[PDB]
């Protein structure tokens, strides 16, 4: 990874805030960046989880995926310098710009997420935490996957309505698991960010898509993206599209958009 001296960094603006550090809006010497410092005092532990993320990322070169311009580990605090994403997570994005998109604009959005997912996957790297939160939107509307790592454990014991039931019940999480979760941002950004099966408890999720109940069409959802997003939530996961198929499927539908004005039944 790129080693980047301090004198080449400003901090303007904390723009997210931890324990353990900060995110800032910066400049980078002259361009926007994103900066995630380290406190003093970090453990081994952290060391090794916060570079091993900037490792991760150093790692991948994709659209859909942040970019790193490189880290300050030489210095202290230690940081990480990303190019800056105007529009922030992308499930904030979508509650604070509720209608404002075409059924096109959003659709777009999920092919850039299922793209770096495809790529994720293929470079064998299982997200585990795939939520509209955990993505990155630019001021092209590109919607970026980030949050990497190894540093999670499931709630209870990452959310549990966003996990696929192997995950929850037997902690296998592959990138099969992964599609079940990109399913669920389906949802969230066809709904402008709404929360997965609403005031259901955990139980009562778990309990629920036990049972066989999945969640129902967005308003104005295309059939075709509903139908896909019920496929992503397969119990059986070889029975769940790959990456490789939800990106060909969104492909096909956005280069014929008429495709996307019939309508599931709301
Ligand atoms: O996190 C960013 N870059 C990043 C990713 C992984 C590791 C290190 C870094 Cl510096 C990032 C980039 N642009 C924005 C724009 C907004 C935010 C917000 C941070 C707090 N929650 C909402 C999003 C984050 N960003």
Redesign the pocket.
């Known amino acids: 990874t790129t080693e980047i001296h301090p004198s080449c960094v400003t901090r303007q603006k904390v ?3 931890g324990e353990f550090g900060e ?3 910066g400049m980078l010497k002259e361009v926007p ?4 410092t380290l406190k003093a005092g970090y453990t081994e532990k952290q060391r090794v989880d916060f570079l091993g ?2 490792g991760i ?1 150093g790692q991948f070169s994709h659209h859909n995926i ?1 970019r ?1 311009e490189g880290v300050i580990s030489k210095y202290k605090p230690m ?11 992308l499930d ?1 994005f979508l509650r604070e710009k509720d209608g404002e998109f075409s059924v096109l604009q959003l659709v777009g959005m999920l092919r850039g997420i299922a793209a770096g997912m495809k790529y994720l996957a293929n470079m064998n790297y299982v997200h585990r935490d795939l939520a509209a ?1 955990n993505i ?1 939107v ?1 001021s092209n509307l590109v919607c970026k996957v ?3 790592g190894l540093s999670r454990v499931l709630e209870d014991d990452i959310p549990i309505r966003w996990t696929a039931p192997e995950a929850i019940s037997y902690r296998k999480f592959t990138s099969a698991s992964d599609v079940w979760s990109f399913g669920i941002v389906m949802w969230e950004v066809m709904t402008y960010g709404e929360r997965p099966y609403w005031e259901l408890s955990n139980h009562e999720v778990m309990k629920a898509i036990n049972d066989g109940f999945r969640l129902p069409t967005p308003m104005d959802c295309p059939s075709a993206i509903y139908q896909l997003m019920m496929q992503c939530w397969q119990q059986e996961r070889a029975r769940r599209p790959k990456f490789a198929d939800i990106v060909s499927i969104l492909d096909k539908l956005i280069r014929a958009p008429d495709s996307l004005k019939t309508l599931a039944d709301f």
Not at 33 to 36: D, G, L
Request: net charge neutral; hydrophobic share 50%.
């Open positions: 723009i997210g805030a995110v800032y809006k960046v994103a900066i995630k993320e900037a990322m942040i790193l940081m990480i310098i990303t190019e800056y994403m105007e529009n922030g997570a904030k939160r990155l630019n980030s949050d990497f």
